[PDB]
């Protein structure tokens, strides 16, 4: 599926439970894996609007080339049946991270 070889750290604490579940099932049903912890093996980190990242986390993300994205990256990729350009879904783009 479109998320093959993708490992998503999910930081989506403030999403409704139904949406958290749907993000997870969208990821798993389309070849991806997810974790709630950020580690070097993560390829992506999904951040809802109300979640933020520490400087420590941002440093880890830079070092390990993790893509920061919003939930829309998942929703839209699923809708379009195609892995989209993750650079257009980066909440920390304003910081150039």
Author numbering: 4 to 100
From the publication, what sentences describe this entry?
pmcPARP4 is an ADP-ribosyltransferase (ART) that uses NAD+ as substrate to add ADP-ribose onto target proteins, a process called mono(ADP-ribosylation) or MARylation.
The BRCT domain was crystallized using sitting drop vapor diffusion. Molecular replacement phasing of the diffraction data was realized using the AlphaFold predicted structure of PARP4 BRCT domain. Crystals of the BRCT domain diffracted to 1.75 Å and belong to space group F23 with one molecule in the asymmetric unit; the refined structure has a crystallographic R/RFREE of 0.175/0.188. The major differences exist in loop regions connecting the core secondary structure elements, for example, the residues connecting strands β2 and β3 in the central beta-sheet. The general fold of the PARP4 BRCT resembles the structure of PARP1 BRCT domain, though the comparison shows some key differences in the positioning of residues that are important for PARP1 BRCT interaction with nucleic acid. The Thr420-Gly421-Thr422 motif in PARP1 is Ser38-Phe39-Ser40 in PARP4 and thus not highly conserved. Indeed, the BRCT exhibited similar binding to each of the vtRNA, indicating that the BRCT domain alone is capable of mediating nucleic acid interaction.
